[PDB]
Design an enzyme around this catalytic site. Structure first.
Site, PDB file in Angstrom:
ATOM      1  N   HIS D 139       0.849  -1.184   0.000  1.00 43.90           N
ATOM      2  CA  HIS D 139       0.000   0.000   0.000  1.00 43.90           C
ATOM      3  C   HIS D 139       0.900   1.255   0.000  1.00 43.90           C
ATOM      4  O   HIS D 139       0.974   1.983   0.991  1.00 43.90           O
ATOM      5  CB  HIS D 139      -0.874  -0.017   1.246  1.00 43.90           C
ATOM      6  CG  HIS D 139      -2.128   0.791   1.129  1.00 43.90           C
ATOM      7  ND1 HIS D 139      -2.378   1.640   0.072  1.00 43.90           N
ATOM      8  CD2 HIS D 139      -3.207   0.876   1.944  1.00 43.90           C
ATOM      9  CE1 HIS D 139      -3.558   2.213   0.240  1.00 43.90           C
ATOM     10  NE2 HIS D 139      -4.079   1.768   1.369  1.00 43.90           N
ATOM     11  N   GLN D 142      -0.245   4.786   1.084  1.00 41.65           N
ATOM     12  CA  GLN D 142      -0.510   4.831   2.518  1.00 41.65           C
ATOM     13  C   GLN D 142       0.800   5.039   3.286  1.00 41.65           C
ATOM     14  O   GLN D 142       0.838   5.761   4.302  1.00 41.65           O
ATOM     15  CB  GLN D 142      -1.246   3.564   2.977  1.00 41.65           C
ATOM     16  CG  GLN D 142      -1.586   3.512   4.463  1.00 41.65           C
ATOM     17  CD  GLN D 142      -2.782   4.382   4.856  1.00 41.65           C
ATOM     18  OE1 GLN D 142      -3.912   4.148   4.418  1.00 41.65           O
ATOM     19  NE2 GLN D 142      -2.540   5.365   5.716  1.00 41.65           N
ATOM     20  N   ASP D 237      -4.066  -2.614  12.876  1.00 42.11           N
ATOM     21  CA  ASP D 237      -5.013  -2.773  11.785  1.00 42.11           C
ATOM     22  C   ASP D 237      -6.082  -3.777  12.224  1.00 42.11           C
ATOM     23  O   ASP D 237      -5.974  -4.361  13.303  1.00 42.11           O
ATOM     24  CB  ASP D 237      -4.280  -3.224  10.514  1.00 42.11           C
ATOM     25  CG  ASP D 237      -5.146  -3.134   9.264  1.00 42.11           C
ATOM     26  OD1 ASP D 237      -6.089  -2.304   9.225  1.00 42.11           O
ATOM     27  OD2 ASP D 237      -4.885  -3.906   8.312  1.00 42.11           O
ATOM     28  N   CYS D 278      -5.161   2.695   9.817  1.00 40.70           N
ATOM     29  CA  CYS D 278      -5.512   3.216   8.499  1.00 40.70           C
ATOM     30  C   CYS D 278      -7.024   3.356   8.302  1.00 40.70           C
ATOM     31  O   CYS D 278      -7.475   3.899   7.289  1.00 40.70           O
ATOM     32  CB  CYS D 278      -4.871   2.387   7.385  1.00 40.70           C
ATOM     33  SG  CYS D 278      -5.622   0.757   7.150  1.00 40.70           S
TER      34      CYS D 278
END
Lengths: 344, 344, 344, 344
Positions: D139, D142, D237, D278
């Site tokens: 990612h 990100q 996460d 995130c």
């Protein structure tokens, strides 16, 4: 009369120097310019970039000053503000000589001061547009703001009825009568019977001619609840003149006590009646001044015992009071006057 | 009330949160912005360059979406469209957390979805203007479009008469009643007697207060030809809710069959009566849906046997139908709402 | 706190109505804007063309007035300055009425005057951003400029140490304590032990909440040399009030005579200590007022005998004195506030 | 390393194809672009007028989509959003043919999808910059946002400590390890011991080499409290991916149950630790998904009884939580990538 409504170069010394068409033009333009600002059109369209105006105040008048300052800025003009210390004329220099110099520096001149004759000299000797921001005789920028406000509310004003109540012989009262004549309304000047005998007779004569031409009428009254009948607008003003001594205070409110705008008067008028006041107004005890009046005359005159004077807080807080819309409109109207007169 | 009509930063969650002056401002601004586009003024005057809005639709609503998309673009804003797949809230993330993020990316947020509470959370947690694009309780952008349309036709709306006929307890019907109160009109909510008992009573209470303040009245009726008498506007809506099963269809049109807008009703109203409908409308058999209704219920209810339902094609094709003007006005009104709220 | 930092539409009445994140954003935005001006970016980028502000001063405050003047002009705003003549609220008109008119004309208002409640009324009734230019209670624009100056020199301020010394109970001293709390610094308020009981206990509670949340601490002291240990910043203010009578005058300097900032103190602190003073300062005999003091007192009080009072010329001329960078930052910080608050 | 930093024409396919200098450049440019938007500099400076990008989403990722949409729009580029129905490469057409066509129409391409090899083909055959919006493997956008957020809080990141805790073998965990290598940070991957075996070996090898160069360290751990010692950053996460069968849920939560981030963990770290996630995060029961989980399990697994999973609501509401700054930064960091890559 049926020439073009071209106001370029003209001065707003007295509204009486203008035709009925010219007056309606000013009012309509005002409404247009208001609508234009709400859309943000003054951001890219500033027609007076390259122009400067001087705004003189030989006595302070913050409402008129702020309106001139925001209107001119919106248009793109520079403005220089000269207060009482620099606005006194005829003492250190002849007003003629001062005028001839201001006309060299500036593209337009506003002046607020006592003598209408001062305005006349400025207009004659400067050679640029002059705008009377209030004198002993008349308040012509205020006229455009007031009748613009009524028009926003009712549309066409012909044969509508307005009562100006109180010290109706003062400059505001007389200014309102001129506006009523230009708009073909029926005016009732409601206050002490003898006040009408102090109104300049040339002004009356001209208003009379306008009423005959445009419609409406002029009538004097001594009776608040009578005057109110069928009225679309009720317009009042202060009973006092800050700077005069206790005697004349006492005298005036003695003559005026029966003419305070209350819910009674509002109720006698139409359902849609609006209340107007050029402000500031004394309508409660939230001023150090209302207080030292409710205190030292609340005895003799119980009518001012709560600070209230020309109008009651009950009226002032009701949905009839449009004095804040009327206040805002001083800017849009002065903008119309500056634009028409300087030109794009 | 008599503070400035400053809407910067405000959200259009429910029109009831706004003053009467604020509502009239939105309507007038709308008309101004319409007139401005016809002159091509939006070409050089795009006040929201530098701004972006998100427009969420948890169920599809193409008319509201297109209006938002053209209005924002005309103003100079970027728009990102999030359909049902991305608009579902409270499932994958708390609506609070979603709100706090949208407020970081975007200068304004539109939301169409079922729960008014969703709108409330968005307004509370995002910190930017939120615009309710339709919920179960209210359709406030549609209100500005509708009353703008009536005003374009009649001018000042006070004491004019409007009949909303049909499922008058639904969000459109209730929205129309709120608009009528803000504009001081007389409303007749014309349909089944018991529907009035389903209208949220806090809403009624507020409308009542508005009617007392602005004029007009609220009245419920069961009689179409009575209701029509002296009406300036007749406003209807669909009898059906696509996605519910045959039973409730049958039920509803059974309750509603006496309230279809026909030339009879139009003829009972004034000569200048206009017909309104937020659309789409079922007024003929030119839809696969009207067909499988005229076919499977044209038996019981001969009134829908030609596809027609809430209104007849005879009314829809007449000069009274202003629903397409009303449709166009969704854009101009939403543009007024975005401009006032984001600011130039 | 999870919320977006969005200062749009907000008034700066007291810094204490703001989050820690919002205070940092103002400090950082000011630094950015300072850098942008040095590159000349304000020539082509003027986000407030089409906006106008009023700056009102009910007592002259030339330094604050100029900062607003330059800041607003760089942004493209018009400014209208109203001095004492026209800024006295509550005498000839209710502050509420005045506030409601100001908001019709202007996009933002600065107000400098004695009563914090005056600022409160302006905020409540104008409907536009209001900026506290200084009241008896707090000086919020100075705070942003002060801590900006500290950050410019030291970076992140958390756990750094500041000594405000002298009349720490006054509005500058209190304001500084507030600023240190927002930045998680260690404050030592240094002077007469009695002065601490005169600090609003609500302000104290809030600062203590902010210290707990952000770091740092609050301590009082009587010994300037012990207070200076490990100090990154020493900040002081005048001992006198101009206009104040002799007795009080003499009383203060008797109480403060042991709290003058001199090189001894500077050296007790860190090598990189900076000295701050919102100015004007009496640090020599170059003002006619210093001379009048070293004469009428100074036998009785030999510190003030060379004209120096709160600080010595030796410190004032040293590389530690950042008071002039602090002065320049009045403008950059006020620009951050106007920009954040009106919006681009 | 000596080469100029020039990303023009480059694709953001994996951060590991970039030098340490190129990654810092992107982080730093992200911060600059953020400061510039706050001053309104994107109104007059739009360097990508005339460019168009396509943003493809094979699976809907609302947050990444909005960041692209707003970033590109600020820069002046048009954007075409293509959702799942339109982004399914390799089925109805070869991805190579599709890439060739996309390069003819657009100046840049974003792609979010499961297979990294789809990004590789777009990069290879389109000839324009291609930005990985999120794959099974990484990612990269990100990463820039995340480490930007850390730098804005701490300054230089070298030798600072971060803990990634939870499902650390997923694309977000591995991505965080990558960003930590580029920043010379000490990473602790905290969770089930057998996870470290699931991480691509080449990636580990490349990270090892970056740590050697930049100065961090890689370290695995099974003890949440031990790992947190001296941590400046704690990043976690979700434990569940919508939507696998139930069996995989309770398998996962069975493995992860000891690794929930709670205030005991936060307090074991430094006082100034910051928490990152995130989003969406499941930190309470305000999502329907939370409830369903707290219901079906919560008996078997008490931690997830209140809806909380990877992080407790107590931490999520603490002043430590920066996830919303981290969310905003998705936009600025994506803006830096688009600008660096398309060029001004």
């Amino acid at each position: 009369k049926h020439m073009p409504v071209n106001l370029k170069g003209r001065s707003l010394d007295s509204l009486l120097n203008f035709t009925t068409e010219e007056v309606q033009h000013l009012i309509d333009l005002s409404i247009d310019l208001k609508k234009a600002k709400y859309q943000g059109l003054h951001i890219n369209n500033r027609p007076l970039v390259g122009k400067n105006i001087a705004i003189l105040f030989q006595k302070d008048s913050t409402r008129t000053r702020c309106a001139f300052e925001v209107a001119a800025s919106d248009l793109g003009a520079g403005v220089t503000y000269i207060g009482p210390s620099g606005s006194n004329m005829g003492k250190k220099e002849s007003i003629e000589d001062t005028a001839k110099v201001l006309g060299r520096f500036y593209d337009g001149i506003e002046f607020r001061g006592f003598a209408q004759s001062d305005v006349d000299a400025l207009v004659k000797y400067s050679g640029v547009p002059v705008w009377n921001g209030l004198t002993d005789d008349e308040h012509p920028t205020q006229i455009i703001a007031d009748f613009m406000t009524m028009k926003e509310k009712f549309g066409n004003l012909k044969n509508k009825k307005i009562v100006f109540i109180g010290d109706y012989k003062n400059n505001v009262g007389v200014s309102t009568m001129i506006g009523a004549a230009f708009n073909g309304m029926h005016v009732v000047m409601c206050g002490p019977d003898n006040y009408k005998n102090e109104i300049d007779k040339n002004v009356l004569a001209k208003c009379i001619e306008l009423f005959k031409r445009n419609g409406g009428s002029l009538r004097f009254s001594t009776d608040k609840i009578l005057a109110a009948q069928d009225a679309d607008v009720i317009y009042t003003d202060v009973w006092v003149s800050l700077g005069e001594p206790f005697e004349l205070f006492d005298k005036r409110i003695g003559e005026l006590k029966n003419f305070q705008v209350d819910m009674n008067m509002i109720k006698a008028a139409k359902n849609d009646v609006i209340f107007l006041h050029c402000l500031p107004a004394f309508h409660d005890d939230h001023t150090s001044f209302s207080k030292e009046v409710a205190t030292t005359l609340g005895a003799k005159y119980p009518i001012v015992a709560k600070g209230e004077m020309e109008v009651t807080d009950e009226v002032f807080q009701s949905l009839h009071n449009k004095a804040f819309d009327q206040a805002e409109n001083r800017m849009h109207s002065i903008k119309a006057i500056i634009l028409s007169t300087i030109g794009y």
